[PDB]
Structure formats: structure tokens, C-alpha cells
PDB file of C-alpha atoms and ligand atoms in Angstrom:
ATOM      1  CA  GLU A   5      24.334 -18.065 -18.616  1.00 22.54           C
ATOM      2  CA  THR A   6      24.570 -19.623 -15.057  1.00 22.13           C
ATOM      3  CA  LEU A   7      22.339 -18.122 -12.332  1.00 18.08           C
ATOM      4  CA  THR A   8      24.659 -16.911  -9.539  1.00 18.91           C
ATOM      5  CA  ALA A   9      23.608 -15.780  -6.054  1.00 16.92           C
ATOM      6  CA  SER A  10      24.717 -12.182  -6.961  1.00 15.55           C
ATOM      7  CA  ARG A  11      22.647 -12.187 -10.214  1.00 14.92           C
ATOM      8  CA  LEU A  12      19.541 -13.435  -8.333  1.00 15.87           C
ATOM      9  CA  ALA A  13      20.098 -10.889  -5.483  1.00 15.85           C
ATOM     10  CA  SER A  14      20.304  -8.073  -8.138  1.00 15.77           C
ATOM     11  CA  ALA A  15      16.838  -8.971  -9.531  1.00 16.47           C
ATOM     12  CA  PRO A  16      13.604  -7.528  -7.965  1.00 13.43           C
ATOM     13  CA  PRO A  17      12.112  -9.806  -5.225  1.00 14.45           C
ATOM     14  CA  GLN A  18       8.938 -10.026  -7.436  1.00 14.11           C
ATOM     15  CA  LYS A  19      10.984 -11.779 -10.178  1.00 13.31           C
ATOM     16  CA  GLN A  20      13.231 -14.173  -8.179  1.00 14.78           C
ATOM     17  CA  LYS A  21      10.952 -17.281  -7.883  1.00 15.94           C
ATOM     18  CA  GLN A  22      10.056 -16.917 -11.625  1.00 15.08           C
ATOM     19  CA  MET A  23      13.792 -16.860 -12.544  1.00 14.46           C
ATOM     20  CA  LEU A  24      14.565 -19.924 -10.390  1.00 13.19           C
ATOM     21  CA  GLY A  25      11.560 -21.776 -11.875  1.00 14.21           C
ATOM     22  CA  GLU A  26      12.756 -21.140 -15.460  1.00 16.15           C
ATOM     23  CA  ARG A  27      16.126 -22.813 -14.603  1.00 17.14           C
ATOM     24  CA  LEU A  28      14.699 -25.603 -12.365  1.00 15.81           C
ATOM     25  CA  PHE A  29      12.034 -26.812 -14.837  1.00 15.20           C
ATOM     26  CA  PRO A  30      14.384 -28.209 -17.640  1.00 14.15           C
ATOM     27  CA  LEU A  31      16.524 -30.016 -15.013  1.00 17.49           C
ATOM     28  CA  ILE A  32      13.504 -31.600 -13.278  1.00 17.42           C
ATOM     29  CA  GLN A  33      12.126 -32.410 -16.787  1.00 18.97           C
ATOM     30  CA  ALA A  34      15.326 -34.384 -17.561  1.00 19.23           C
ATOM     31  CA  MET A  35      14.476 -36.670 -14.563  1.00 21.75           C
ATOM     32  CA  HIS A  36      10.624 -36.820 -14.425  1.00 19.05           C
ATOM     33  CA  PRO A  37       9.086 -35.023 -17.460  1.00 18.19           C
ATOM     34  CA  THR A  38       5.461 -36.055 -16.613  1.00 18.76           C
ATOM     35  CA  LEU A  39       5.330 -34.385 -13.162  1.00 15.34           C
ATOM     36  CA  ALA A  40       8.074 -31.747 -13.847  1.00 12.53           C
ATOM     37  CA  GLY A  41       5.614 -28.793 -13.922  1.00 12.96           C
ATOM     38  CA  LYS A  42       4.042 -29.760 -10.576  1.00 13.33           C
ATOM     39  CA  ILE A  43       7.402 -30.707  -8.948  1.00 11.53           C
ATOM     40  CA  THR A  44       8.904 -27.339 -10.082  1.00  9.78           C
ATOM     41  CA  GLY A  45       6.054 -25.448  -8.371  1.00 10.37           C
ATOM     42  CA  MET A  46       6.559 -27.488  -5.171  1.00 10.72           C
ATOM     43  CA  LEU A  47      10.380 -27.115  -5.080  1.00 13.48           C
ATOM     44  CA  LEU A  48       9.970 -23.323  -5.568  1.00 12.74           C
ATOM     45  CA  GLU A  49       8.752 -23.286  -1.907  1.00 12.99           C
ATOM     46  CA  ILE A  50      12.368 -23.985  -0.837  1.00 12.59           C
ATOM     47  CA  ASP A  51      14.482 -20.928   0.209  1.00  9.63           C
ATOM     48  CA  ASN A  52      16.222 -19.208  -2.739  1.00  9.75           C
ATOM     49  CA  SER A  53      19.803 -19.938  -1.424  1.00  9.25           C
ATOM     50  CA  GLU A  54      19.062 -23.692  -1.165  1.00  9.95           C
ATOM     51  CA  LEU A  55      17.497 -23.544  -4.695  1.00  9.65           C
ATOM     52  CA  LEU A  56      20.709 -21.931  -6.097  1.00  9.13           C
ATOM     53  CA  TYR A  57      22.758 -24.749  -4.489  1.00 10.34           C
ATOM     54  CA  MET A  58      20.341 -27.369  -6.005  1.00 10.00           C
ATOM     55  CA  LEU A  59      20.692 -25.779  -9.494  1.00 10.41           C
ATOM     56  CA  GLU A  60      24.441 -26.679  -9.233  1.00  6.39           C
ATOM     57  CA  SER A  61      24.107 -30.031  -7.360  1.00  4.41           C
ATOM     58  CA  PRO A  62      22.421 -32.707  -9.527  1.00  8.18           C
ATOM     59  CA  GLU A  63      22.205 -35.324  -6.722  1.00  6.82           C
ATOM     60  CA  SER A  64      20.670 -32.810  -4.237  1.00  8.06           C
ATOM     61  CA  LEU A  65      18.098 -31.774  -6.856  1.00 10.82           C
ATOM     62  CA  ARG A  66      17.442 -35.518  -7.628  1.00 11.64           C
ATOM     63  CA  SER A  67      16.746 -36.384  -3.977  1.00 11.76           C
ATOM     64  CA  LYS A  68      14.413 -33.325  -3.612  1.00 10.65           C
ATOM     65  CA  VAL A  69      12.552 -34.321  -6.848  1.00 11.70           C
ATOM     66  CA  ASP A  70      12.157 -37.892  -5.431  1.00 11.18           C
ATOM     67  CA  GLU A  71      10.908 -36.453  -2.101  1.00  9.41           C
ATOM     68  CA  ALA A  72       8.381 -34.215  -4.007  1.00  8.67           C
ATOM     69  CA  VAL A  73       7.184 -37.310  -5.986  1.00 10.27           C
ATOM     70  CA  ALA A  74       6.581 -39.116  -2.628  1.00  8.34           C
ATOM     71  CA  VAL A  75       4.594 -36.069  -1.328  1.00  9.08           C
ATOM     72  CA  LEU A  76       2.259 -36.301  -4.407  1.00  8.07           C
ATOM     73  CA  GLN A  77       1.642 -40.065  -3.936  1.00  9.58           C
ATOM     74  CA  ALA A  78      -1.835 -40.767  -2.427  1.00 10.14           C
ATOM     75  CA  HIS A  79      -2.388 -43.132   0.596  1.00 12.78           C
ATOM     76  CA  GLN A  80      -2.533 -46.973  -0.068  1.00 15.41           C
TER      77      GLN A  80
ATOM     78  CA  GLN B   4      39.739  -5.271 -11.039  1.00 13.83           C
ATOM     79  CA  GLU B   5      38.568  -1.814 -12.259  1.00 13.50           C
ATOM     80  CA  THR B   6      37.141   0.955 -10.034  1.00 11.91           C
ATOM     81  CA  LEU B   7      33.428   1.362 -10.926  1.00 13.45           C
ATOM     82  CA  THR B   8      32.319   4.984 -11.393  1.00 11.31           C
ATOM     83  CA  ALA B   9      28.978   6.793 -11.486  1.00 12.87           C
ATOM     84  CA  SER B  10      29.630   7.870 -15.171  1.00 13.57           C
ATOM     85  CA  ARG B  11      30.577   4.287 -16.245  1.00  7.29           C
ATOM     86  CA  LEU B  12      27.401   2.925 -14.567  1.00  7.34           C
ATOM     87  CA  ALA B  13      25.132   5.681 -16.011  1.00 10.06           C
ATOM     88  CA  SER B  14      26.093   4.417 -19.545  1.00  9.61           C
ATOM     89  CA  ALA B  15      24.582   0.929 -18.832  1.00 11.58           C
ATOM     90  CA  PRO B  16      20.826   0.036 -18.397  1.00  8.29           C
ATOM     91  CA  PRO B  17      19.536   0.461 -14.775  1.00  6.74           C
ATOM     92  CA  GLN B  18      19.149  -3.329 -14.072  1.00  9.30           C
ATOM     93  CA  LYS B  19      22.649  -3.878 -15.538  1.00  8.00           C
ATOM     94  CA  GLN B  20      24.013  -1.187 -13.073  1.00  6.18           C
ATOM     95  CA  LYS B  21      22.470  -3.157 -10.115  1.00  5.30           C
ATOM     96  CA  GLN B  22      23.935  -6.420 -11.514  1.00  5.72           C
ATOM     97  CA  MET B  23      27.470  -4.851 -11.681  1.00  5.16           C
ATOM     98  CA  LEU B  24      27.229  -3.407  -8.165  1.00  2.00           C
ATOM     99  CA  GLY B  25      25.645  -6.670  -6.912  1.00  3.17           C
ATOM    100  CA  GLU B  26      28.602  -8.753  -8.254  1.00  2.69           C
ATOM    101  CA  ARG B  27      31.006  -6.658  -6.126  1.00  2.00           C
ATOM    102  CA  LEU B  28      28.730  -6.347  -3.028  1.00  2.39           C
ATOM    103  CA  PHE B  29      27.538  -9.970  -2.710  1.00  2.06           C
ATOM    104  CA  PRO B  30      30.927 -11.695  -1.905  1.00  2.00           C
ATOM    105  CA  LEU B  31      31.674  -9.045   0.784  1.00  2.09           C
ATOM    106  CA  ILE B  32      28.161  -9.257   2.326  1.00  2.00           C
ATOM    107  CA  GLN B  33      28.301 -13.090   2.216  1.00  2.00           C
ATOM    108  CA  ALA B  34      31.650 -12.974   4.121  1.00  2.00           C
ATOM    109  CA  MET B  35      29.775 -11.018   6.949  1.00  2.00           C
ATOM    110  CA  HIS B  36      26.295 -12.658   6.935  1.00  2.00           C
ATOM    111  CA  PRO B  37      26.265 -15.753   4.699  1.00  2.00           C
ATOM    112  CA  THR B  38      22.622 -16.775   5.598  1.00  2.00           C
ATOM    113  CA  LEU B  39      20.957 -13.434   4.808  1.00  2.00           C
ATOM    114  CA  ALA B  40      23.530 -12.371   2.097  1.00  2.00           C
ATOM    115  CA  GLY B  41      21.111 -12.604  -0.848  1.00  2.78           C
ATOM    116  CA  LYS B  42      18.389 -10.597   0.979  1.00  2.00           C
ATOM    117  CA  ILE B  43      20.841  -7.968   2.367  1.00  4.70           C
ATOM    118  CA  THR B  44      22.423  -7.558  -1.122  1.00  6.75           C
ATOM    119  CA  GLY B  45      19.013  -7.093  -2.749  1.00  6.09           C
ATOM    120  CA  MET B  46      18.091  -4.487  -0.089  1.00  5.63           C
ATOM    121  CA  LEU B  47      21.378  -2.529  -0.286  1.00  3.79           C
ATOM    122  CA  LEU B  48      21.104  -2.438  -4.123  1.00  5.78           C
ATOM    123  CA  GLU B  49      18.190   0.025  -3.692  1.00  7.08           C
ATOM    124  CA  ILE B  50      20.701   2.624  -2.335  1.00  6.61           C
ATOM    125  CA  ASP B  51      21.932   5.332  -4.825  1.00  7.98           C
ATOM    126  CA  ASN B  52      24.871   4.130  -6.992  1.00  8.60           C
ATOM    127  CA  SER B  53      27.275   6.811  -5.665  1.00  8.55           C
ATOM    128  CA  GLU B  54      26.655   5.782  -2.021  1.00 11.31           C
ATOM    129  CA  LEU B  55      27.102   2.085  -3.058  1.00 10.02           C
ATOM    130  CA  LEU B  56      30.468   2.921  -4.769  1.00 11.20           C
ATOM    131  CA  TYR B  57      31.606   4.644  -1.548  1.00  9.69           C
ATOM    132  CA  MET B  58      30.592   1.558   0.555  1.00 11.38           C
ATOM    133  CA  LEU B  59      32.522  -0.746  -1.890  1.00 13.80           C
ATOM    134  CA  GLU B  60      35.677   1.220  -0.903  1.00 15.56           C
ATOM    135  CA  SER B  61      34.723   1.836   2.776  1.00 13.47           C
ATOM    136  CA  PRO B  62      34.515  -1.465   4.780  1.00 13.76           C
ATOM    137  CA  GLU B  63      33.322   0.432   7.888  1.00 11.64           C
ATOM    138  CA  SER B  64      30.348   1.975   5.992  1.00  7.34           C
ATOM    139  CA  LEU B  65      29.415  -1.274   4.282  1.00 13.33           C
ATOM    140  CA  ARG B  66      29.340  -3.100   7.679  1.00 10.36           C
ATOM    141  CA  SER B  67      27.074  -0.417   9.305  1.00 10.47           C
ATOM    142  CA  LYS B  68      24.672  -0.573   6.291  1.00  9.52           C
ATOM    143  CA  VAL B  69      24.676  -4.410   6.451  1.00  8.65           C
ATOM    144  CA  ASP B  70      23.795  -4.160  10.237  1.00 10.26           C
ATOM    145  CA  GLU B  71      20.973  -1.675   9.376  1.00  9.13           C
ATOM    146  CA  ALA B  72      19.654  -4.096   6.676  1.00  9.36           C
ATOM    147  CA  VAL B  73      19.868  -7.007   9.199  1.00  7.33           C
ATOM    148  CA  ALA B  74      17.675  -4.958  11.611  1.00  7.92           C
ATOM    149  CA  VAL B  75      15.093  -4.407   8.795  1.00  6.60           C
ATOM    150  CA  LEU B  76      14.986  -8.230   8.141  1.00  5.49           C
ATOM    151  CA  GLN B  77      14.504  -9.090  11.867  1.00  4.72           C
ATOM    152  CA  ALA B  78      10.983 -10.321  12.648  1.00  3.34           C
ATOM    153  CA  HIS B  79       8.680  -9.138  15.531  1.00  2.78           C
TER     154      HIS B  79
ATOM    155  CA  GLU C   5     -10.054  -7.890   0.537  1.00  2.71           C
ATOM    156  CA  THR C   6      -7.376  -8.684   3.224  1.00  4.20           C
ATOM    157  CA  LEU C   7      -4.531 -11.018   2.227  1.00  5.91           C
ATOM    158  CA  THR C   8      -4.555 -14.048   4.559  1.00  3.78           C
ATOM    159  CA  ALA C   9      -1.589 -16.423   4.969  1.00  2.88           C
ATOM    160  CA  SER C  10      -3.754 -19.268   3.527  1.00  2.00           C
ATOM    161  CA  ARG C  11      -4.667 -17.169   0.431  1.00  2.00           C
ATOM    162  CA  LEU C  12      -0.959 -16.293  -0.180  1.00  5.55           C
ATOM    163  CA  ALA C  13       0.062 -19.995   0.346  1.00  9.10           C
ATOM    164  CA  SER C  14      -2.523 -21.120  -2.283  1.00  9.41           C
ATOM    165  CA  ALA C  15      -0.925 -18.771  -4.918  1.00  9.41           C
ATOM    166  CA  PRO C  16       2.071 -20.001  -7.063  1.00  7.29           C
ATOM    167  CA  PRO C  17       5.482 -19.144  -5.486  1.00  7.07           C
ATOM    168  CA  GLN C  18       6.242 -17.048  -8.650  1.00  7.42           C
ATOM    169  CA  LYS C  19       3.349 -14.659  -7.698  1.00  5.85           C
ATOM    170  CA  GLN C  20       3.736 -14.309  -3.899  1.00  4.60           C
ATOM    171  CA  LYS C  21       6.256 -11.362  -3.682  1.00  3.03           C
ATOM    172  CA  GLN C  22       4.272  -9.558  -6.475  1.00  3.42           C
ATOM    173  CA  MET C  23       1.016  -9.987  -4.462  1.00  2.00           C
ATOM    174  CA  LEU C  24       2.656  -8.724  -1.272  1.00  2.00           C
ATOM    175  CA  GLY C  25       4.163  -5.763  -3.190  1.00  2.00           C
ATOM    176  CA  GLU C  26       0.725  -4.739  -4.579  1.00  2.00           C
ATOM    177  CA  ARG C  27      -0.598  -4.539  -0.971  1.00  2.00           C
ATOM    178  CA  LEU C  28       2.507  -2.939   0.589  1.00  2.00           C
ATOM    179  CA  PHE C  29       3.042  -0.173  -2.011  1.00  2.00           C
ATOM    180  CA  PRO C  30      -0.201   1.892  -1.362  1.00  2.00           C
ATOM    181  CA  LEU C  31       0.355   1.710   2.431  1.00  2.00           C
ATOM    182  CA  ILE C  32       4.037   2.756   2.186  1.00  2.00           C
ATOM    183  CA  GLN C  33       3.105   5.519  -0.351  1.00  2.00           C
ATOM    184  CA  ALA C  34       0.543   6.880   2.216  1.00  2.00           C
ATOM    185  CA  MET C  35       3.290   7.541   4.880  1.00  2.00           C
ATOM    186  CA  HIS C  36       6.302   8.040   2.454  1.00  2.00           C
ATOM    187  CA  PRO C  37       5.171   9.000  -1.127  1.00  2.00           C
ATOM    188  CA  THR C  38       8.762   9.995  -2.069  1.00  2.00           C
ATOM    189  CA  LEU C  39      10.908   6.778  -2.216  1.00  2.00           C
ATOM    190  CA  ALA C  40       7.845   4.450  -1.822  1.00  2.00           C
ATOM    191  CA  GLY C  41       8.980   2.247  -4.736  1.00  2.00           C
ATOM    192  CA  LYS C  42      12.462   1.762  -3.223  1.00  2.00           C
ATOM    193  CA  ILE C  43      11.098   1.117   0.314  1.00  2.00           C
ATOM    194  CA  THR C  44       8.577  -1.469  -1.055  1.00  2.00           C
ATOM    195  CA  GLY C  45      11.334  -3.253  -3.005  1.00  2.00           C
ATOM    196  CA  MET C  46      13.566  -3.305   0.108  1.00  2.00           C
ATOM    197  CA  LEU C  47      10.809  -4.592   2.476  1.00  4.57           C
ATOM    198  CA  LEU C  48       9.920  -7.365  -0.062  1.00  6.77           C
ATOM    199  CA  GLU C  49      13.212  -9.035   0.953  1.00  4.56           C
ATOM    200  CA  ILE C  50      11.629  -9.817   4.388  1.00  5.56           C
ATOM    201  CA  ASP C  51      10.098 -13.325   4.873  1.00  3.44           C
ATOM    202  CA  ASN C  52       6.466 -13.534   3.561  1.00  2.45           C
ATOM    203  CA  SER C  53       5.024 -14.435   7.067  1.00  2.00           C
ATOM    204  CA  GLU C  54       6.588 -11.297   8.599  1.00  2.00           C
ATOM    205  CA  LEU C  55       5.288  -9.233   5.637  1.00  2.00           C
ATOM    206  CA  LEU C  56       1.709 -10.543   6.216  1.00  2.00           C
ATOM    207  CA  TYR C  57       1.968  -9.470   9.898  1.00  2.00           C
ATOM    208  CA  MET C  58       3.254  -6.013   8.774  1.00  2.00           C
ATOM    209  CA  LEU C  59       0.261  -5.620   6.397  1.00  2.00           C
ATOM    210  CA  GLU C  60      -2.110  -6.143   9.434  1.00  2.00           C
ATOM    211  CA  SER C  61       0.056  -4.230  12.079  1.00  2.00           C
ATOM    212  CA  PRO C  62       0.486  -0.454  11.198  1.00  3.25           C
ATOM    213  CA  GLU C  63       3.001  -0.270  14.126  1.00  2.29           C
ATOM    214  CA  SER C  64       5.479  -2.767  12.675  1.00  2.00           C
ATOM    215  CA  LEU C  65       4.995  -1.404   9.069  1.00  2.37           C
ATOM    216  CA  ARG C  66       5.835   2.235  10.078  1.00  4.52           C
ATOM    217  CA  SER C  67       8.946   1.178  12.073  1.00  2.00           C
ATOM    218  CA  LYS C  68      10.141  -1.041   9.142  1.00  2.00           C
ATOM    219  CA  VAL C  69       9.543   1.842   6.656  1.00  2.00           C
ATOM    220  CA  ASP C  70      11.604   4.159   8.974  1.00  3.64           C
ATOM    221  CA  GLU C  71      14.369   1.502   9.179  1.00  2.95           C
ATOM    222  CA  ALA C  72      14.366   1.204   5.316  1.00  4.08           C
ATOM    223  CA  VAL C  73      14.575   5.039   5.044  1.00  3.56           C
ATOM    224  CA  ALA C  74      17.698   4.919   7.310  1.00  4.80           C
ATOM    225  CA  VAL C  75      19.283   2.252   5.034  1.00  6.59           C
ATOM    226  CA  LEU C  76      18.749   4.527   1.970  1.00  8.17           C
ATOM    227  CA  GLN C  77      20.271   7.610   3.721  1.00  6.02           C
ATOM    228  CA  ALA C  78      23.769   8.411   2.321  1.00  6.87           C
ATOM    229  CA  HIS C  79      26.700   8.847   4.751  1.00  8.81           C
ATOM    230  CA  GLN C  80      27.662  12.311   6.105  1.00  8.60           C
ATOM    231  CA  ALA C  81      31.349  13.254   5.374  1.00  8.15           C
TER     232      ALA C  81
ATOM    233  CA  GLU D   5     -18.952 -25.985   8.380  1.00  9.00           C
ATOM    234  CA  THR D   6     -17.505 -29.379   7.201  1.00  6.32           C
ATOM    235  CA  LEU D   7     -15.948 -29.472   3.690  1.00  5.47           C
ATOM    236  CA  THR D   8     -17.571 -32.338   1.740  1.00  7.57           C
ATOM    237  CA  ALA D   9     -16.354 -33.646  -1.637  1.00  8.92           C
ATOM    238  CA  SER D  10     -19.713 -32.507  -3.218  1.00 13.54           C
ATOM    239  CA  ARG D  11     -19.375 -28.930  -1.759  1.00 10.25           C
ATOM    240  CA  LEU D  12     -15.776 -28.654  -3.078  1.00 10.81           C
ATOM    241  CA  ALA D  13     -16.760 -30.101  -6.532  1.00 10.34           C
ATOM    242  CA  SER D  14     -19.495 -27.401  -6.961  1.00  6.71           C
ATOM    243  CA  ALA D  15     -16.832 -24.608  -7.029  1.00  7.12           C
ATOM    244  CA  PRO D  16     -14.307 -23.663  -9.848  1.00  7.68           C
ATOM    245  CA  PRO D  17     -10.922 -25.558  -9.859  1.00  8.54           C
ATOM    246  CA  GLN D  18      -8.711 -22.698  -8.414  1.00  7.73           C
ATOM    247  CA  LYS D  19     -11.492 -21.795  -5.872  1.00  8.95           C
ATOM    248  CA  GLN D  20     -11.203 -25.493  -4.717  1.00  9.37           C
ATOM    249  CA  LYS D  21      -7.471 -25.108  -3.879  1.00  7.53           C
ATOM    250  CA  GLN D  22      -8.113 -21.880  -1.895  1.00  7.68           C
ATOM    251  CA  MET D  23     -10.933 -23.621   0.089  1.00  7.23           C
ATOM    252  CA  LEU D  24      -8.656 -26.567   0.890  1.00  2.33           C
ATOM    253  CA  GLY D  25      -5.829 -24.131   1.754  1.00  2.02           C
ATOM    254  CA  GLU D  26      -8.056 -22.264   4.288  1.00  3.37           C
ATOM    255  CA  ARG D  27      -8.687 -25.598   6.129  1.00  3.02           C
ATOM    256  CA  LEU D  28      -5.129 -26.998   5.797  1.00  2.00           C
ATOM    257  CA  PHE D  29      -3.190 -23.838   6.812  1.00  2.00           C
ATOM    258  CA  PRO D  30      -4.336 -23.538  10.521  1.00  2.00           C
ATOM    259  CA  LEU D  31      -3.635 -27.281  11.122  1.00  2.00           C
ATOM    260  CA  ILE D  32      -0.182 -27.130   9.427  1.00  2.00           C
ATOM    261  CA  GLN D  33       0.595 -23.832  11.285  1.00  2.00           C
ATOM    262  CA  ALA D  34      -0.188 -25.610  14.623  1.00  2.00           C
ATOM    263  CA  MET D  35       2.539 -28.185  13.692  1.00  2.00           C
ATOM    264  CA  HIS D  36       5.201 -25.931  12.003  1.00  2.00           C
ATOM    265  CA  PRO D  37       4.321 -22.211  12.345  1.00  2.00           C
ATOM    266  CA  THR D  38       7.479 -20.905  10.554  1.00  2.00           C
ATOM    267  CA  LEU D  39       7.175 -23.251   7.525  1.00  2.00           C
ATOM    268  CA  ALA D  40       3.324 -23.343   7.432  1.00  2.00           C
ATOM    269  CA  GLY D  41       2.954 -21.140   4.307  1.00  2.00           C
ATOM    270  CA  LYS D  42       5.553 -23.158   2.347  1.00  2.00           C
ATOM    271  CA  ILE D  43       4.196 -26.569   3.485  1.00  2.00           C
ATOM    272  CA  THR D  44       0.578 -25.516   2.655  1.00  2.00           C
ATOM    273  CA  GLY D  45       1.579 -24.294  -0.820  1.00  2.00           C
ATOM    274  CA  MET D  46       3.427 -27.534  -1.547  1.00  2.00           C
ATOM    275  CA  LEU D  47       0.655 -29.862  -0.171  1.00  2.00           C
ATOM    276  CA  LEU D  48      -1.907 -27.990  -2.326  1.00  2.00           C
ATOM    277  CA  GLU D  49      -0.305 -29.704  -5.371  1.00  2.00           C
ATOM    278  CA  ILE D  50      -1.770 -33.055  -4.121  1.00  2.00           C
ATOM    279  CA  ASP D  51      -5.078 -34.203  -5.747  1.00  2.00           C
ATOM    280  CA  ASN D  52      -8.188 -32.671  -4.070  1.00  2.00           C
ATOM    281  CA  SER D  53      -9.646 -36.097  -3.035  1.00  2.00           C
ATOM    282  CA  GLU D  54      -6.400 -37.011  -1.191  1.00  2.00           C
ATOM    283  CA  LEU D  55      -6.397 -33.504   0.447  1.00  2.00           C
ATOM    284  CA  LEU D  56     -10.033 -34.023   1.660  1.00  2.00           C
ATOM    285  CA  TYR D  57      -8.960 -37.381   3.167  1.00  2.00           C
ATOM    286  CA  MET D  58      -6.014 -35.691   4.959  1.00  2.00           C
ATOM    287  CA  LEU D  59      -8.395 -33.050   6.442  1.00  2.00           C
ATOM    288  CA  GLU D  60     -10.329 -35.957   8.034  1.00  2.00           C
ATOM    289  CA  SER D  61      -7.251 -38.044   8.964  1.00  2.00           C
ATOM    290  CA  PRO D  62      -4.896 -36.243  11.420  1.00  2.00           C
ATOM    291  CA  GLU D  63      -2.278 -39.087  11.168  1.00  2.00           C
ATOM    292  CA  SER D  64      -2.126 -38.904   7.336  1.00  2.00           C
ATOM    293  CA  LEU D  65      -1.932 -35.049   7.375  1.00  2.00           C
ATOM    294  CA  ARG D  66       0.968 -35.328   9.892  1.00  2.00           C
ATOM    295  CA  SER D  67       2.934 -37.822   7.702  1.00  2.00           C
ATOM    296  CA  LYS D  68       2.441 -35.563   4.603  1.00  2.00           C
ATOM    297  CA  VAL D  69       3.544 -32.488   6.600  1.00  2.00           C
ATOM    298  CA  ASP D  70       6.693 -34.438   7.719  1.00  2.00           C
ATOM    299  CA  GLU D  71       7.422 -35.393   4.063  1.00  2.00           C
ATOM    300  CA  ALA D  72       6.997 -31.710   3.001  1.00  2.00           C
ATOM    301  CA  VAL D  73       9.316 -30.618   5.900  1.00  2.00           C
ATOM    302  CA  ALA D  74      11.993 -33.027   4.551  1.00  2.00           C
ATOM    303  CA  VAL D  75      11.628 -31.446   1.046  1.00  2.00           C
ATOM    304  CA  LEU D  76      12.215 -27.957   2.593  1.00  2.00           C
ATOM    305  CA  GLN D  77      15.240 -29.068   4.756  1.00  2.00           C
ATOM    306  CA  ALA D  78      18.530 -27.493   3.474  1.00  2.00           C
ATOM    307  CA  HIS D  79      21.671 -29.640   2.947  1.00  2.00           C
ATOM    308  CA  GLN D  80      23.449 -27.906   5.920  1.00  2.00           C
TER     309      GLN D  80
HETATM  310 CL1  LIG E   1      24.116 -15.091   8.637  1.00  2.00          CL
HETATM  311 CL1  LIG E   2       8.275 -24.372  12.217  1.00  2.00          CL
END
């Protein structure tokens, strides 16, 4: 099944970030499997509507994953 | 598209009822308030199924409930 | 314990609405024991920062509970 | 009190993130009050030694906050 905005809106607010995480994790894992768990947790801070867009836009998710990777990188 | 009824919804599990009502409500709410659509939909899905079925056939009533939900979401 | 914005921010995003719900429910139940579960669920749609303010301000919580009660009220024919 | 690496190291791992969060949050809130909670949660995924450096380097905290803000920025 594909997570729609109506299906997410129908779920209790307590379960929405969990549901988005479950779908985000395999996609992030297909790009950067080593930091996927950490990156997933970070990207879950993004508003739910933007996360639903990212679940359907591979290049938008890619650029956010790359931005999260840069956030984790320590100073030179 | 079929008219949803209280008896037809009562036959399905409670979360499935909310999903069915949510699928009809979300596109209409998004047409009014696209930014808060997901939040408004989630909120309005707490209303009794019979009142929700009325609102799905009464654009005037849906709009006033959406405006009431928007007031609830407004910060102080 | 009182839920601070820093304590909520340190929790995983998957747990934040659940944590806010656990704090909101007893307070809502105290002024509206009837549809407390529904009101809590509705108010959890509000942004987390505004919910943290509402947990500290009884003023804003009561008015939001009253507004939620109005949303639940069925139309008069 | 000033948070030293030895003081942080003496506490359990999750207690360490909460302690760093308590120091990071007011500084991040001063910069971006609306996104403070989200930015703090995301920056807490960074290694504790790099977080302690950022708490003592206002310029490096600012550049990390800006990177986190870009991660949160919606496509529209
Ligand atoms: Cl809007
Ligand atoms: Cl801000």
C-alpha cells in the first residue's frame, strides 16, 4: 500500500510519525544504509505534509538525506 | 461514487470507518485549507459518523466545522 | 515532573505526540471527563510548541477544550 | 554550571542527550523560536563531543542550526 495524506490524517496523531518512519527508513536505506536509522530519525522532524511529498519524490528525499548527512559531519 | 451510511460503516472496524470517511473528507478540506488539511481532517474525524456523513453532503456545514477546527489550531 | 520543550525535543519524533497525550489526557479529563479521549485526540493535532504552552497555561487549555467541544457538537436541524 | 566532557561522560547515554538538549534548546530558540524543538531534536543526533564543541563555539552552533533549517525547509 501507498501512504496517502488521507490515510495518514485518519490515523491517531500518536501514530503518525511512527507510520512515516516505517516508510521512510527503507528508502533512505537504499541510498545510505549505514546512517539510515539516524537520518530517518532526523528527517522525521520535518512536517508530515512535506514528508508525504518526499515519500513520492525520490530527488527531494535524496537532497534531504544529503543535507542530513552534512548536519552529522563534525567540524574540520 | 456510493453514498456512505451509518449501517455500512458500523459493519467495518472503527479505524477502517475513519479511513473511509477520511478519504472523502480530505480532498474537500484540502480544497479549502491546503496547509492545515491533514490536521483539520484528523480533528474532524473525531466527530460522530452520522454528523460526518451529513457534512459530506452539506458544503455549508463542512465549511463552518473546518473554520471551527482552524480556530482550535490557531496559536496564542 | 513538568514536560519542558528541551525534554520533548530530546525524545524520538515517534514518541512526542504520545508523550503530550499522556500529559493532556488527565487535565482534559478533570474539566471534561465525558469525551476526554476525543478532545485529547483532537488537540494533539495542534503544533507541539503550542501544546507545551497549553500544558503550562490552564487559561489556553480550557478555551481550547471548549473550542474542541464545539467542533464535536452535531448541527441543529 | 558549565557542562564538561567528564561531567557528561559520568551519566548514562540517554541522560547525556537530555543534558545537551537542555543547553542547546535555549540558544537554538533564541535563533529560530518556531523551529527550535525540531532543530534541537535533529542536532541531538550529532556525536556528543561535537555537540559539546558547538556549545562552546557560537559560530559553529549557528552554521549547524542553518544546516538543520535547510533540512526542515519545504519544497514550496
Ligand atoms: Cl491553508
Ligand atoms: Cl523560527
